[PDB]
Design a protein around this motif. Structure first.
Motif, PDB file in Angstrom:
ATOM      1  N   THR A  10      -2.274  11.537  -9.204  1.00 45.32           N
ATOM      2  CA  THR A  10      -2.906  10.621  -8.263  1.00 45.32           C
ATOM      3  C   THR A  10      -2.046   9.390  -8.024  1.00 45.32           C
ATOM      4  O   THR A  10      -1.932   8.919  -6.888  1.00 45.32           O
ATOM      5  CB  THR A  10      -4.287  10.207  -8.772  1.00 45.32           C
ATOM      6  OG1 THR A  10      -4.175   9.699 -10.106  1.00 45.32           O
ATOM      7  CG2 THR A  10      -5.253  11.386  -8.760  1.00 45.32           C
ATOM      8  N   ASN A  11      -1.432   8.856  -9.075  1.00 48.16           N
ATOM      9  CA  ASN A  11      -0.641   7.641  -8.988  1.00 48.16           C
ATOM     10  C   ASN A  11       0.814   7.898  -8.631  1.00 48.16           C
ATOM     11  O   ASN A  11       1.594   6.945  -8.560  1.00 48.16           O
ATOM     12  CB  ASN A  11      -0.714   6.887 -10.316  1.00 48.16           C
ATOM     13  CG  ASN A  11      -2.114   6.429 -10.639  1.00 48.16           C
ATOM     14  OD1 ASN A  11      -3.089   6.993 -10.148  1.00 48.16           O
ATOM     15  ND2 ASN A  11      -2.224   5.405 -11.471  1.00 48.16           N
ATOM     16  N   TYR A  13       2.396   8.069  -6.101  1.00 48.62           N
ATOM     17  CA  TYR A  13       2.945   7.333  -4.966  1.00 48.62           C
ATOM     18  C   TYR A  13       3.870   6.197  -5.399  1.00 48.62           C
ATOM     19  O   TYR A  13       4.747   5.793  -4.630  1.00 48.62           O
ATOM     20  CB  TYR A  13       1.806   6.785  -4.107  1.00 48.62           C
ATOM     21  CG  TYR A  13       1.067   5.639  -4.751  1.00 48.62           C
ATOM     22  CD1 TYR A  13       1.312   4.330  -4.375  1.00 48.62           C
ATOM     23  CD2 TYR A  13       0.128   5.868  -5.742  1.00 48.62           C
ATOM     24  CE1 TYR A  13       0.642   3.288  -4.966  1.00 48.62           C
ATOM     25  CE2 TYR A  13      -0.545   4.832  -6.338  1.00 48.62           C
ATOM     26  CZ  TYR A  13      -0.285   3.545  -5.950  1.00 48.62           C
ATOM     27  OH  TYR A  13      -0.959   2.512  -6.553  1.00 48.62           O
ATOM     28  N   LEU A  17       8.134   3.295  -4.715  1.00 48.98           N
ATOM     29  CA  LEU A  17       8.570   1.956  -5.082  1.00 48.98           C
ATOM     30  C   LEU A  17       9.725   2.025  -6.069  1.00 48.98           C
ATOM     31  O   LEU A  17      10.692   1.261  -5.971  1.00 48.98           O
ATOM     32  CB  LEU A  17       7.401   1.183  -5.687  1.00 48.98           C
ATOM     33  CG  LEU A  17       6.136   1.073  -4.831  1.00 48.98           C
ATOM     34  CD1 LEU A  17       5.025   0.411  -5.626  1.00 48.98           C
ATOM     35  CD2 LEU A  17       6.368   0.332  -3.538  1.00 48.98           C
TER      36      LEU A  17
END
Lengths: 57, 57
Positions: A10-11, A13, A17
């Motif tokens: 889920t994280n 993404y 960064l």
């Protein structure tokens, strides 16, 4: 403890960064892309050696 | 499938974090060092024009 994998998926993404960060960190180079087409080496000329301009009188 | 809306709203702080990413990565110094290629350049010479040899007496 099964939620570790769910959380990572889920994280995920945040790796964008991270990619931006490592891109800013890394030094950079580039190319000057080479030319093909030295298919014809060229000789000087038909050259003949001789004495220069004699100064007669 | 509704979870995406919740994740977006919850993780919105990463937007400001990403703004920091880009607007300080720009501040950090980068230099893409475009090369000279494997083939090397060279100019003719410092060439100056003058009158040739004069036959004085």
């Amino acid at each position: 403890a099964s939620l570790i994998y769910r959380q990572l998926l889920t994280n995920s993404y945040s790796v964008d960064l991270y990619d931006e960060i490592e891109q800013i960190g890394s030094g950079k180079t580039q190319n000057v892309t080479i030319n093909p087409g030295p298919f014809a080496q060229t000789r000087y000329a038909p050259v003949n050696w001789d004495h220069g301009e004699i100064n007669d009188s």
